[PDB]
Design a protein around this nucleic acid. Structure first.
Ligand SMILES: [Zn+2]
Lengths: 77, 102, 104, 91, 86
RNA sequence: AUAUGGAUUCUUCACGGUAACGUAACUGAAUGUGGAGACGUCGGCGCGAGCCCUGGGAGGAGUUAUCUUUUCUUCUUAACAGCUUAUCACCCCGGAAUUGGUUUAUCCGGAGAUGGGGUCUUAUGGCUGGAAGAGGCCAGCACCUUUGCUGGCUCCGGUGCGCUUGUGACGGCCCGUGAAAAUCCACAGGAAGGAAUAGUUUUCAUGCCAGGUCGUACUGAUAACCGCAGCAGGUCUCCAAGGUGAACAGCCUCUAGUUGAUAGAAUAAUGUAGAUAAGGGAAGUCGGCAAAAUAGAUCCGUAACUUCGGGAUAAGGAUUGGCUCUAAGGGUCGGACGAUCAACUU
RNA sequence: UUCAAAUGAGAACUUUGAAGACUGAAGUGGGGAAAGGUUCCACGUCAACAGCAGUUGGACGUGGGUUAGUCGAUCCUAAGA
């Protein structure tokens, strides 16, 4: 399993003609000081690797789930 | 530095059936709790308040849920109330005096 | 206080049968056979080890790129960076001495 | 200080083997463990290994020589005689 | 070795009849000379199916047993019904 | 087998750094040379892992005549991938007596030390993905189905002449110097061909196909092997907790395992194994045979003889429990001390 | 070693529960190499066998069971043939 940090590469990867399935995981964490935030993980299945992107902001994850390609299968949880 | 935790205990199921009282419970707690040494050293450090439907303890010194379960089992065995009542937990630091499966 | 076992048919404590004890995500202790260590490549004259070149097993050099097995200079992956200055200087001086002996 | 009166290195042999044999091995064992001078180095780092073979720690050299000392009197005198026979044949 | 010598019998013990149900795996008895290529070929050609893998084992009695797994587009229950034994 | 991207080129076969060297790539025939595979035994020292020990907290179980913030238990993180991490080794500046740096162990410096600044191998650790969705521990709710549901918590640390094991740099020993080949990689050499209209790149990234034959059950020994047998006998190896203790000795205990070996009733002489004994102390017997006595550790002390290394634990004396204290022995933080933390020896 | 129940024609010896002890991590524990060859598991069963017994059994009768691109052999060479 690999990991990507830049979002353009993630979107590009969701459109590699070989990815079929993705998964959206929700993790209730805490930011080491006082507050529980809702970290989100996007996991795209390749054919020899599995790629992952981690977002802490909720709005960015909403925009991701919005602009995901409308041809890819997505397992919520 | 001294962030006070709160311990709330439900007593209802035995209380409403004649087999329990909350006032002796609260007095037993307030006079057997130890601080740094023997009992009787609660100088505005812990506070026990009875309500009949909830018993509340607030402390600032060393305290835990295990200490409270220890003192409660002591009280119950002294009053011959094991085999009928059992101390349990519902949330983190919220407890209740349920019944053994009669 | 939990005890472990070999995981292959070889029951002896030879060179190729080396165990580590590991804690799995299931709560238990388990053996794990480790592989042999790697030696750094050596100078062809100096005998010393070489910089830059990564240390692996022999076959594993067939799956690594060309930059992990060489440096950017003459005798890049075989000689020493100091056993090369010497064999430059000696060649130059020998040709010079030959030229002077032919002049006289 | 001197922890032994006379046995020295051979103190490891204890009471065994007889006195004269220990007195004989003492000379050779003191010889074969000392450090000598490298000539191509200027430094005193020579040290035996595999009798006959004397190795420089620095300088990575290797010389042949005696079995318990770098150079024995016989080969010294042989070298002297060859050095003497050099001039009479140069001219 | 024709594909009538290769596949000899089906195995019908009630421990084997559960793999065809849950695991979707046909258990066969093949000849001591067939290999994992010929077994795949013969099964595919006799029952027009999609074989995913074949495992084999030489039993203590002397013969050789095959575990042939099918793909998600077929049903070993129905195929064994067509062969007759269930 | 190859297609889609990327890089190189009209200077045909790439750039940066003074240097150690760096990188996503970045052609190389015959012949030649190199490296790994590839190696003895011991000693202490440093580091890492599992186990042991232990503090706070979140749940569950035990005891409670009296006492105990108590006793036991759960609190886990695989191969693999990316970023990063050190002893050694190396480079640049500099030019050292008033001799310096330095290991438990004495070696190093004009053949360039100490010092300042950098480069490398990644054992080994740290973080992130794999991965909490898994596994563990709890609470509630439903049952003549052979089969389920929903909630929670799964966190933060300390210590070491500890045990087991891996590994690094050193030291010692030899009239003893402690395998070979398959296989893989690189270097030197410069054949051939090609570009800029398409090549070169399959040692850069992603994408497609396949991986055959035999073993695989169970025991491994006071019942599975070899002994005429189901014989108190024989035969190679791995893992391995707490106390007492110098200790893998003896004695007790947790996790696992066993409760197997004909039984019942009485208690004579004898036999076998284990003990005590008044006064005497070898008078017994061929003969102190067999038994008895001594025994750990700390201190005072120790002869003849000697191949000077030994004899030697020579011989001969004295002490040892429990409890309350005293003095000595360290780290890390602020430039004489000031604060705090931790261990077990005398 | 002991108590009760269950099964059985029949119980000191089989099964369950309760108590009492033992091996004491150089084990009476958990795995293998060679060797053995079905001794593994289920069902039934007691003519003989397990030096008393037996409803038990590695016995007796009938069936089930061993799945690999990554663990071994296969490949290499050593002393030697
Ligand atoms: Zn020298």
């Amino acid at each position: 399993a690999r990991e990507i940090t830049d979002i353009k590469q993630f979107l590009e990867l969701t459109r590699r003609a070989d990815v079929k399935t993705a998964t959206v995981k929700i993790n209730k964490k805490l930011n080491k000081a006082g507050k529980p935030f809702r970290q989100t993980k996007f996991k795209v299945r390749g054919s020899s690797s599995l790629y992952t992107l981690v977002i802490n902001d909720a709005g960015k994850a909403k925009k991701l789930i919005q602009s995901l390609p409308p041809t890819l299968k997505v397992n919520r949880l | 530095q001294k962030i006070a935790k709160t311990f709330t205990v439900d007593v209802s199921s035995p209380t409403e059936n004649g087999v329990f009282d909350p006032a002796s419970y609260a007095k037993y707690l307030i006079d057997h709790i130890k601080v740094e040494g023997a009992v009787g050293n609660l100088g505005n450090a812990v506070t026990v308040t009875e309500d009949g439907t909830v018993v509340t303890v607030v402390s600032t010194a060393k305290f835990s849920g295990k200490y409270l379960k220890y003192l409660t089992k002591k009280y119950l065995k002294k009053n011959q109330l094991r085999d009928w009542i059992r101390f349990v937990s519902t949330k983190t630091n919220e407890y209740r005096l349920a019944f053994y499966q009669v | 206080a939990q005890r472990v076992t070999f995981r292959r048919r070889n029951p002896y404590n030879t060179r190729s049968n080396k165990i580590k004890v590991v804690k799995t995500p299931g709560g238990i202790l388990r053996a794990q056979h480790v592989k042999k260590l790697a030696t750094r490549p050596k100078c062809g004259d100096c005998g010393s080890a070489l910089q830059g070149i990564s240390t692996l097993r022999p076959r594993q050099y067939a799956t690594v790129s060309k930059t992990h097995k060489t440096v950017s200079r003459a005798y890049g992956g075989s000689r020493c960076a100091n056993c090369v200055k010497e064999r430059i200087i000696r060649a130059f001086l020998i040709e010079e001495q030959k030229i002077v002996k032919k002049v006289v | 200080a001197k922890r032994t009166k006379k046995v020295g290195i051979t103190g490891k042999y204890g009471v065994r083997y007889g006195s004269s044999l220990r007195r004989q091995v003492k000379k050779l064992e003191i010889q074969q463990h000392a450090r000598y001078d490298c000539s191509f180095c200027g430094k005193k780092t020579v040290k035996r290994g595999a009798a006959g073979i004397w190795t420089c720690s620095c300088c990575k050299k290797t010389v042949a020589g005696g079995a318990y000392t770098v150079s024995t009197a016989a080969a010294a005198t042989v070298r002297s005689t060859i050095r003497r026979l050099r001039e009479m044949v140069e001219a | 070795l024709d594909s009538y010598k290769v596949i000899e019998q089906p195995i019908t013990s009630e421990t084997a009849m559960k793999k065809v149900e849950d695991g979707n795996i046909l258990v066969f008895q093949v000849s001591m000379k067939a290999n994992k290529y010929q077994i795949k070929k013969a099964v595919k050609e006799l029952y027009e199916v999609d074989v995913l893998k074949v495992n084999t084992l030489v039993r203590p009695n002397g013969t050789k047993k095959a575990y042939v797994r099918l793909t998600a587009d077929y049903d070993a229950l129905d195929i064994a019904n067509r062969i007759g034994y269930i």
